[PDB]
Amino acid sequence: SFDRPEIYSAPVLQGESPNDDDNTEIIKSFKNFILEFRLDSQFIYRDQ
Amino acid sequence: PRTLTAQHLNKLVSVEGIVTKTSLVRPKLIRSVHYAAKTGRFHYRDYTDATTTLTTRIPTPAIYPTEDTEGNKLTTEYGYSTFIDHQRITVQEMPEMAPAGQLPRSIDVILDDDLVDKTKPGDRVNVVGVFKSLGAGGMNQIGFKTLILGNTVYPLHARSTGVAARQMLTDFDIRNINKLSKKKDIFDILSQSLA
Amino acid sequence: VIIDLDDILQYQNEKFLQGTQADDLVSAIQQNANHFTELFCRAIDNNMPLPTKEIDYKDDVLDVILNQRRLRNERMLSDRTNEIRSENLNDALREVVEDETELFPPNLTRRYFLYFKPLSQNCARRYRKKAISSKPLSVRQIKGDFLGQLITVRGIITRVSDVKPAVEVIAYTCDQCGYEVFQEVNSRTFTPLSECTSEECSQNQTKGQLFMSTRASKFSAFQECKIQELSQQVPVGHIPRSLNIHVNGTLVRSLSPGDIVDVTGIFLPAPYTGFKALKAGLLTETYLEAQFVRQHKKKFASFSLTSDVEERVMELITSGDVYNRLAKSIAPEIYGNLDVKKALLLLLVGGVDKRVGDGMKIRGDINVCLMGDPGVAKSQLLKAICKISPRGVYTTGKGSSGVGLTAAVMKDPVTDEMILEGGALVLADNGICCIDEFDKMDESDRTAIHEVMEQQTISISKAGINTTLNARTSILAAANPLYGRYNPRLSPLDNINLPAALLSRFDILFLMLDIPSRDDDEKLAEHVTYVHMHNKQPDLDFTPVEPSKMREYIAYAKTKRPVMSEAVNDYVVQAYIRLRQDSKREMDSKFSFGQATPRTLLGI
Amino acid sequence: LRIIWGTNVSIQECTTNFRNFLMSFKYFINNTTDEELYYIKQLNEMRELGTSNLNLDARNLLAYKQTEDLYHQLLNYPQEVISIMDQTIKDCMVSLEIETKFYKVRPYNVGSCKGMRELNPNDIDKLINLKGLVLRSTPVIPDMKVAFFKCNVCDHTMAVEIDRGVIQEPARCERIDCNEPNSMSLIHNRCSFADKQVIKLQETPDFVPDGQTPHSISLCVYDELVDSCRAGDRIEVTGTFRSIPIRANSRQRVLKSLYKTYVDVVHVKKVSDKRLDVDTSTIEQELMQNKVDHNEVEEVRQITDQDLAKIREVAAREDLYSLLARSIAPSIYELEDVKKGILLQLFGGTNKTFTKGGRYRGDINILLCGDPSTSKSQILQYVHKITPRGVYTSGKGSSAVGLTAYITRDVDTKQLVLESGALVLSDGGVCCIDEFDKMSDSTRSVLHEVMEQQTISIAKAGIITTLNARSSILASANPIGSRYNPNLPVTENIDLPPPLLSRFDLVYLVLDKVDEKNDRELAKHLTNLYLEDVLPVEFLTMYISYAKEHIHPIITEAAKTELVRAYVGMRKMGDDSRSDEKRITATTRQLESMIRLAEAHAKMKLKNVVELEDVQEAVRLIRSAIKDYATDPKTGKIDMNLVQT
Ligand SMILES: Nc1ncnc2c1ncn2[C@@H]1O[C@H](COP(=O)(O)OP(=O)(O)O)[C@@H](O)[C@H]1O
Ligand SMILES: [Mg+2]
Ligand SMILES: [Zn+2]
Ligand SMILES: [Zn+2]
């Protein structure tokens, strides 16, 4: 009469160097774009 | 066990014989209680089987809950659940009533809860209960599964056997037993009556 | 960490004299004990002091990884706080960082164990409470009402399994991402993972392959013990029953076969393992989870001289006369026989073992044999000496024959290994063995006794066995003369069945005859009839030392090794010369059990 | 200070720390070898000899201040430390083929520890050492390293490397032209394999806690250390402590939570200072195979020339025979005649091989009859512990099956295998049978063939073959009744058929007499031991091994004359007292006994020539053992007034 076992994780090491067409790199590049891209002197998308 | 046939199924019977083997008393789970640390609430469930009600019901095969109605993980509370004990015994015809040189006949008795540890192997016994047919005898795809659901179990005493003999003493009996003592020839009267 | 509930009771009764409020924590710990392990475990992680010894090169392999992981933990929180401050999107910052990051959970950074110590009866009788926990119980009395509770048992240990690792959390390493996956196991069989379950691998189409890292995994020390009922608890006419006990952590290697113990455990269910055709409902099996072990007879090895052992061994000696005092403290209901009991005490204490050089040994433990006519209380003495010794076994002639003495080959249910099960001689190692009806044994059984008394090892060469058992045991034996009574018309060796070579190996041989004497009989009868009327011994100017206090003094005595000088050597040489000169004239006329030998000098 | 994750190791730190020690090591101290640069001689001689294995003792490092750290680190992370230690060597070697040859280290002095069963789960992946007796070993098992794949549509062949046990099978052909899904097939005999063997060891620890029955352990030896251990060998092994999960059954991929334990062996030691060296006469072809296999497991010990000079310096001594007899058992106050028999039993006779088939061996068999309460029992124990291979048996505790062979079920593979018995395990050693007179006629039957031809023939279900049992027999028997009775003949005092008594080379009657100056000396001897010249154990064993190894004695005509004369004289005696079994009748085995004892005495003192003194000493010993200098040849009685201590 026991319970449900769990699976969990945690970062340890540097894996293989990242290919630029990786999904996570795409997500990170698009997150940089959101908070970085400027037109004039106003950061349009963060404000939006 | 020899004269018990298929025309007595579904009736209350009395069976005589000798106990030949008993099984280990095991717990049976009825109600299980749980805890959710994300909501502070306790949940329960019920379980049942075919050997607890004398009439046929439509089965309900419920499952063991590990998860909440939202997905919260539940801890199992072993001390708050309810368990009821179980045992099975086999009966056979007594050696001094059975036909000589012939193989013996036996019957299975199911006992639960309070009647679970009343006898030991090698005892003369009388059992009363319902002679039940169970399951489907291969018609979903030997015959039917037959057993007795015990309600009464009486130990009996016989010559050269491990079950003792005791009688209930009436107060009238006690009065004679105590009256006899004062007379100072108790030893002689009791001694001369020995065979 | 051993939690004592007698502490919890004092704390809650302190929160009642001062008048504050509290909760009944003891009963909740008692009736649902499996949750409070984790409640306590995490409460103690929250309350933790700091380390004060910089990790060095003399520290365990486990501690290196445990220390490393906490540094790796704090590094990522600092890292992400910096990176969050970078984009400039002191309290909500913590709640953001907490959720944004992945850390090692508490379990893979602990290193301590937590057990519960039952509620003592002495403490429960002071504050007026009823201790369900320290009450012992048989094996029959434990029913389905007792599942999930904290209970104590009384029984005798029949089998103990070796120590093997039990996996609790398996560790995996992914080469594609560099994360670490931790799988939980709580069954007897599990299925290993194949693909990665990390966040990165879970997102990207390319998913790495898992490999097992043995060192990081979570392992526990596991043992399984069988416990049987005592004779005085079995009903009339029934057979004794059994039960299973589990042990984890630093509580392993504490129970050994043949011990009488009281075990504190948590009664928990397991899945059914019987026949399918005989299954009706949700049937389950039971087992016990060990937390605290008590032994009724403390072993001599454990002896460590603290200040209360000082106190009572310091009173024992202040009254002097120790030799006679503890010689008459063996079976104070048996009349007479002081010289036999003086020899018994010395067999209980022992001697000195000598590694002479070249790794050759001399035995330093004494063997005693008793002969006599019927009804002189030999068996009662054997029973008593088996009750006083920490390890000691009582056996009768023909009921213990063959593999019941030496050893047997059986397959281990738990570890699936071929083990050797010990007999009486192997259960009494570092103890006293008591054999009754010595003259009736088989020749095969007598050869083994011969070997054990000479060199303290048993050699077996049978199908499937070529080994040598290590058996350090002292022998106490009883035997009747061949014709029932002693015939002084016949020679001394004509009255004893055993060969003289066996009797030449016993250090001291006592002959207990029954010659009717009118005067002594009235003093023996007085004692016996007094005993049957009062359940105490008849002497009011003598204190019988309790068995525990005798065991303590014997252990402290056994922690000493005296040595011999030259002046004492002269005496022994001179006495041996005269004894050797005198024994020959007695053996020539056929009026001795034995001619003097070097073994008599070793016995002296 | 880069630290490898999960460890405290810095690779560069340890490599540089190790090369200074390897290029400079220090240490009743000499000035020839104890104060020279040690390890560069070891490396140079290695490369000169054409060798690949360096054997690295361990406690060397717990003194030199730098590498102390490395000792603790080596006893905790053997995997990572041993790869650092090899790169030091192949760097150090060219610093002094050596660009394509691989070097290895083998630690063999890890200490402490107290047995396998005292180890906890926190000792996994650690280095430990073991001692014990070998019982079984499975045949070689092939282990795959590189696999072979063929494309069944294009015939392009690929090779893959095992990575921590797993093989990656390509899904698509690699050819740019033929790109098919799932076209790769495995050809088993084109793959590269390696060696694996499993040994079972009976552990013999020093500390045995109360009530431990013996158990068995599993050891895995790979590559070079294959067939380096044989059943009956007492060995010392260094290795790592592992664990592994097992599958519940063949059909399912499910595993069991309780783990299984074993040891990965790195070094094996088959020598001891305190025990004798194995008989090279019985392992001739294993020596040849070891050289062909290039395994540097050393079987015999090294002899320097100072020690060999000592050997002849002592061998020149006038009282060599008394000195050797005295140093056999330096704590058993006893007649030197008894000890001399054990001394000559150890040397053994000359083994002779005919080139037309037909083998003559030189094993000596001794019986120790006599009163109880003597020191016979200690002699057997002492001889058990000085001989390299042996088993100790009781009288009424043995079966024919337990002495010859048997079939058993292996709990690992669940199949039936053959296992050795007591006498076959004692091949080239001493077997000690205690209480020989208490043994059944069925069990005594098997000893006839071992005492005649030194073989055993088994015709059982599964095996029909002849086995080699080249063992020495040392037996002790109990006299009938309380004591030896001088008034009766010897054939009436020992419960053994008179024909069996003649198969033994020496029969020792140990008699007890009451005499005041013997008793005084024995009592002083015993009491001196409970307080607080002879040859120590090491030198005795070294001398005996040297003699047993090199010299080989051959007999001359002057000895032949005396041998024939002595045999005829012995037979002519008691010619009338043959019908009545009063004395032990003389047979041809006594002639062979004289031959064997003369050869053994020649081997002692390092001669290759058996002269007349040897035969005279042999006959003297044979008569003195049976106490023929006090026996009345008509009645068979001993005058105890003439039996002097
Ligand atoms: N000296 C004695 N003192 C007290 N009780 C005795 C004495 N001698 C015999 N008995 C009693 O008589 C019985 C003798 O039984 P047992 O010990 O088996 O004797 P034995 O060993 O000689 O056969 C026991 O009940 C014992 O208590
Ligand atoms: Mg008795
Ligand atoms: Zn991954
Ligand atoms: Zn292709």
UniProtKB/Swiss-Prot annotation, chain A:
UniProt signal peptide: none
Region (Disordered), start-end ranges: 1-21
Compartmental location: Nucleus
Domain of life: Eukaryota
Subunit-level organization: Component of the MCM2-7 complex. The complex forms a toroidal hexameric ring with the proposed subunit order MCM2-MCM6-MCM4-MCM7-MCM3-MCM5; loaded onto DNA, forms a head-head double hexamer. Interacts with CSM1.
Stated role: Acts as a component of the MCM2-7 complex (MCM complex) which is the putative replicative helicase essential for 'once per cell cycle' DNA replication initiation and elongation in eukaryotic cells. The active ATPase sites in the MCM2-7 ring are formed through the interaction surfaces of two neighboring subunits such that a critical structure of a conserved arginine finger motif is provided in trans relative to the ATP-binding site of the Walker A box of the adjacent subunit.
Family per similarity comment: Belongs to the MCM family.
Note: Present with 10300 molecules/cell in log phase SD medium. Early fractionation of eukaryotic MCM proteins yielded a variety of dimeric, trimeric and tetrameric complexes with unclear biological significance. The MCM2-7 hexamer is the proposed physiological active complex.
This protein's name: Minichromosome maintenance protein 5
Gene source species: Saccharomyces cerevisiae (strain ATCC 204508 / S288c)
Gene responsible for this protein: MCM5
Span within the parent record: 2 to 49 of 775
Curated annotation (Swiss-Prot), chain B:
Annotated disulfide bonds: none
Gene name as annotated: MCM3
Keyword Phosphoprotein attributed: yes
Listed GO biological process terms: DNA replication initiation; DNA strand elongation involved in DNA replication; double-strand break repair via break-induced replication; mitotic DNA replication initiation; pre-replicative complex assembly involved in nuclear cell cycle DNA replication; premeiotic DNA replication; silent mating-type cassette heterochromatin formation; subtelomeric heterochromatin formation
Localization in the cell: Nucleus
GO CC terms of this entry: chromosome, telomeric region; CMG complex; cytoplasm; DNA replication preinitiation complex; MCM complex; nuclear pre-replicative complex; nuclear replication fork; nucleoplasm
Protein name, as recorded: DNA replication licensing factor MCM3
Assigned keywords, A-Z: ATP-binding, DNA replication, DNA-binding, Helicase, Hydrolase, Nucleotide-binding, Nucleus, Phosphoprotein
This protein's record includes keyword Phosphoprotein: yes
Record-stated family: Belongs to the MCM family.
Organism classification: Eukaryota, Fungi, Dikarya, Ascomycota, Saccharomycotina
Note: Present with 35100 molecules/cell in log phase SD medium.
Portion of the parent chain present: 168 to 368 of 971
Oligomer and partners: Component of the MCM2-7 complex. The complex forms a toroidal hexameric ring with the proposed subunit order MCM2-MCM6-MCM4-MCM7-MCM3-MCM5; loaded onto DNA, forms a head-head double hexamer. Interacts with CSM1.
Top-level taxonomic group: Eukaryota
Gene Ontology molecular function, alphabetical: ATP binding; ATP hydrolysis activity; chromatin binding; DNA replication origin binding; helicase activity; MCM complex binding; single-stranded DNA binding
Swiss-Prot record, chain C:
Binding site for ATP 2: 505, 599
Top-level enzyme category: hydrolase
Keyword match Cytoplasm: yes
Motif stretch (Arginine finger): 504-507
Primary location group: cytoplasm
Binding site for ATP 1: 335, 375, 377-379, 480
Highest taxon of the lineage: Eukaryota
EC code: 3.6.4.12
GO cellular component assignments: chromosome, telomeric region; CMG complex; cytoplasm; DNA replication preinitiation complex; MCM complex; MCM core complex; nuclear pre-replicative complex; nuclear replication fork
Note: Present with 166 molecules/cell in log phase SD medium. Early fractionation of eukaryotic MCM proteins yielded a variety of dimeric, trimeric and tetrameric complexes with unclear biological significance. Specifically a MCM467 subcomplex is shown to have in vitro helicase activity which is inhibited by the MCM2 subunit. The MCM2-7 hexamer is the proposed physiological active complex.
Function field: Acts as a component of the MCM2-7 complex (MCM complex) which is the putative replicative helicase essential for 'once per cell cycle' DNA replication initiation and elongation in eukaryotic cells. Core component of CDC45-MCM-GINS (CMG) helicase, the molecular machine that unwinds template DNA during replication, and around which the replisome is built.
Family the entry assigns: Belongs to the MCM family.
Protein's name in the database: DNA replication licensing factor MCM7
Native source species: Saccharomyces cerevisiae (strain ATCC 204508 / S288c) (Baker's yeast)
Lineage: Eukaryota, Fungi, Dikarya, Ascomycota, Saccharomycotina
From Swiss-Prot, chain D:
One GO cellular component, as annotated: nuclear replication fork
Origin superkingdom: Eukaryota
Keywords: ATP-binding, Cell cycle, DNA replication, DNA-binding, Helicase, Hydrolase, Nucleotide-binding, Nucleus, Phosphoprotein
Binding site residues for ATP: 370-377
Domain MCM: 320-527
EC number: 3.6.4.12
GO annotation terms (biological process): DNA replication; DNA replication initiation; DNA strand elongation involved in DNA replication; double-strand break repair via break-induced replication; mitotic DNA replication initiation; nuclear DNA replication; pre-replicative complex assembly involved in nuclear cell cycle DNA replication; premeiotic DNA replication
Substrates-to-products reaction catalysed: ATP + H2O = ADP + phosphate + H(+)
GO molecular function, a single term: DNA helicase activity
Compartments (UniProt record): Nucleus
Enzyme type, top EC level: hydrolase
Short sequence motif named Arginine finger, residue ranges: 502-505
More info: Present with 8800 molecules/cell in log phase SD medium.
Annotated function: Acts as a component of the MCM2-7 complex (MCM complex) which is the putative replicative helicase essential for 'once per cell cycle' DNA replication initiation and elongation in eukaryotic cells. The active ATPase sites in the MCM2-7 ring are formed through the interaction surfaces of two neighboring subunits such that a critical structure of a conserved arginine finger motif is provided in trans relative to the ATP-binding site of the Walker A box of the adjacent subunit. The six ATPase active sites, however, are likely to contribute differentially to the complex helicase activity.
Family, as annotated: Belongs to the MCM family.
